[PDB]
Nucleic acid binder design. Structure first.
Ligand code: ZN
Ligand code: ZN
Ligand code: ZN
Ligand code: ZN
Length: 112
DNA sequence: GTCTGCGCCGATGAGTGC
DNA sequence: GCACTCATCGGCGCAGAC
């Protein structure tokens, strides 16, 4: 609907195209008031700002370890739930971590 | 050299509400 | 139609264990 003049990717609205163009201009409008690091995406600055607060607000319901970000907590909880979301494309094996799945698939390929 | 665990990013998407 | 918030998910880097 809204196409990028520089790489042909397409977007839904003026605002999402405007956001994508920052990948090409390097514009980073949103500046951390503590350390001065700038971000292209306001939501990414907000994650960063949690680091300076030092409040690890996201707590594991299984072992009670605390984390700075919700996403970091959720990745951690996979250890407890047994969620293995990375599937080998060649066999039944399932993996907790993407890097491990990738190395396992490469072993299939080296065998042909 | 690989597996684990995790800290911190870029960039896109879903949901929401105007 | 539109923008905003937060989720999502890959990438990367690293340290400890083996
Ligand atoms: Zn582009
Ligand atoms: Zn900062
Ligand atoms: Zn836990
Ligand atoms: Zn396999």
């Amino acid at each position: 609907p809204y196409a990028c003049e520089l790489c042909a990717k397409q977007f839904q609205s003026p605002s999402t195209l405007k956001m994508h163009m920052r990948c090409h201009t390097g514009e980073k409008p949103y500046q951390c008031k503590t350390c001065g690091r700038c971000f292209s995406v306001q939501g990414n600055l907000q994650k960063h700002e949690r680091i300076h607060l030092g409040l690890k607000e996201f707590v594991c319901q299984y072992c009670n370890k605390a984390f700075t970000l919700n996403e970091t907590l959720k990745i951690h909880e996979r250890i407890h739930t047994g969620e293995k979301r990375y599937h080998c494309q060649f066999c039944f094996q399932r993996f907790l971590y993407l890097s491990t799945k990738r190395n396992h698939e490469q072993r299939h390929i080296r065998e042909h």
